[PDB]
Amino acid sequence: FPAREFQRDLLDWFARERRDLPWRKDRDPYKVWVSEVMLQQTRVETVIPYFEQFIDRFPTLEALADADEDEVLKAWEGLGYYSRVRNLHAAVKEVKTRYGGKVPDDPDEFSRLKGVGPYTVGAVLSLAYGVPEPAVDGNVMQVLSRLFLVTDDIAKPSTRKRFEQIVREIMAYENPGAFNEALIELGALVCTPRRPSCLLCPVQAYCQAFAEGVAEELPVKMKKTAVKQVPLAVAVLADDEGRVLIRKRDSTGLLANLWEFPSCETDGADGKEKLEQMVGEQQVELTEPIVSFEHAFSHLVWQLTVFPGRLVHGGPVEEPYRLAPEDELKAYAFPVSHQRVWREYKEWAS
DNA sequence: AAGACGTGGAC
DNA sequence: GTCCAGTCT
Ligand code: SF4
Ligand SMILES: [Ca+2]
Ligand SMILES: [Ca+2]
Ligand SMILES: [Ca+2]
């Protein structure tokens, strides 16, 4: 494999075409690490405003570590896959507590941190510290599957390990961070899933898939399974003084530690009744439902139905619930589904 | 291994 | 509608 003629060419292309993204302003390990977590299964264009806002709020690792969990989650509100930021928050706290605020440059110690998998180890340490670890994301797997005509299913962990070995074989130990970011940028800008720009492509000469005319069929990936449908009844409960009842989800599993309007997973069966029974347990009367809408997750679809109701206080509002004046709802981090619940509630109200 | 785990944007 | 931008369990 003509590594040098591939490398020199990839990196020259990158020097010319590299996007001036916010996290490329410097090689600060904290800012890099934040961006690499935010970018997990999230497009660059989506990340940009979140990254800018997050770094303004949490300018250093210490700032992030010292912040309240609710503040950090609100900074992630709407980005999706919220355990990323809970893991990052813990990883920074551990980096502060254990390492005094210096991001480990040891791969095993960096990898020991929550949220830091093989991609994030390679991305951060190669960029920040020059450590020659591979940084294999979807872009890289697309590029390598085409270059070396690798047909193994990339859903398999073992496939990713094969790509990691290829990177180690063709890397540029001279400039590891720049090699890694260049391979990713190639997949971002050129070696795209549909209609890849093979003719423009710098490393076209080395592409087995190009020769064979099969780039549009790679990488190989098993079609996704159809997802579960889940009915969800949601109560929007306001008292005479405009405050609304919300509750914090447990830290285990779906939308962990986010706030929501109280909801009961129904089986499509007696929703309004299930909601009234749910609140009584942990005084309230619900009207007819005002809207029904769906909300997609990667692995299930919520079918939401919103029931207005009136709240009469008969005791202390006990955890996990909170009585929030309308003007303070904006302080809490809500999943997009419940942001829409509230929007629909307000539209109906008017 | 393979399901859990969000969301928006482009086909 | 499908596809697509990592890590924990
Ligand atoms: S020639 Fe086409 S398929 Fe091959 S690396 Fe370039 S863009 Fe991807
Ligand atoms: Ca790890
Ligand atoms: Ca890509
Ligand atoms: Ca739970």
Residue numbers in the entry: 8 to 289, 293 to 360
Which text from the study accompanies this structure?
MUTYH is a clinically important DNA glycosylase that thwarts mutations by initiating base-excision repair at 8-oxoguanine (OG):A lesions. Improperly placed adenines within pro-mutagenic OG:A base pairs are removed by the adenine glycosylase MUTYH, as the first step in Base Excision Repair (BER). The [4Fe-4S] cluster is coordinated by four cysteine ligands within the N-terminal catalytic domain, while the Zn(II) ion is coordinated by three cysteine ligands in the interdomain connector region (IDC) and one histidine within the catalytic domain. A loop made by two Cys residues that coordinate the [4Fe-4S] cluster, referred to as the iron-sulfur cluster loop, mediates electrostatic interactions with the DNA backbone that are critical for recognition of the lesion containing substrate.
